[PDB]
Amino acid sequence: SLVKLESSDEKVFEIEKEIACMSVTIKNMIEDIGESDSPIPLPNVTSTILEKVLDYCRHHHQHPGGSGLDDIPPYDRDFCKVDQPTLFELILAANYLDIKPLLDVTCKTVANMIRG
Amino acid sequence: SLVKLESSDEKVFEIEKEIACMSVTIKNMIEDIGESDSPIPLPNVTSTILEKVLDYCRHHHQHPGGSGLDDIPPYDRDFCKVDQPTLFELILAANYLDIKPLLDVTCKTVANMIRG
């Protein structure tokens, strides 16, 4: 079922429990509380950012990837098309949830822009 | 004893073994290899960056902190005084070594500048 993850902006982001397990932080919370359909608020990540965090996690789970070597998918490129403050917010949320794929891709995005 | 950590720029950064344990990546390497005084090169983080990564880790170990709420220490502020490409390099090295204090502080540095 969908675990209900309210943001700091109180927006309920219902996403599959199996997806929320990729986030080390959310996973560990579910483990300490036990298997609960109880909504887990995240008082750090806002609605606009948690939207893209969990939507990337939808992409990553339903389509095994979230990354590309010489194969740049349309979604994943348009995902990285955010303003520089908003980009740092994606870094904050990815470190807060300790999502290794999201954190690495977002840190590589800025790395490609400054080296390219 | 001091574990000898060569950078990508081949510079030997000898730092206490007990400090290198805060880095999840370096710690796990020491565990797989076993307790060895053998020098561990890091072919990702350069000399200038690994200098500050391990020197922050010196500060963090010898002085329990590396962070401040309303108490901003001189070192920790001058540590964050780096150029924007160099700042992204600190993010890369902190994610590469999976050092939670360093990664969080450096991600908070940019967060304070864009919101302030």
UniProtKB/Swiss-Prot annotation, chains A, B:
Cellular localisation: Cytoplasm; Nucleus
Sites of N-acetylserine modification: 1
Any one cellular-component term (Gene Ontology): nucleus
One term of GO molecular function: WD40-repeat domain binding
Post-translational modification: O-linked glycan consists of linear Gal-Gal-Fuc-Gal-GlcNAc.
Domain of life the protein comes from: Eukaryota
Keyword line: Acetylation, Cytoplasm, Glycoprotein, Hydroxylation, Nucleus, Ubl conjugation pathway
GO terms (BP aspect): protein ubiquitination; SCF-dependent proteasomal ubiquitin-dependent protein catabolic process; sorocarp development
Subunit (UniProt): Multiprotein complex (SCF) with cullin and F-box-containing protein. Capable of undergoing aggregation.
Additional notes on this entry: There are two genes coding for Skp1, they only differ in a single position in the coding region.
Entry's family note: Belongs to the SKP1 family.
Protein's name according to its UniProt entry: SCF ubiquitin ligase complex protein SKP1a
Organism: Dictyostelium discoideum (Social amoeba)
Lineage: Eukaryota, Amoebozoa, Evosea, Eumycetozoa, Dictyostelia
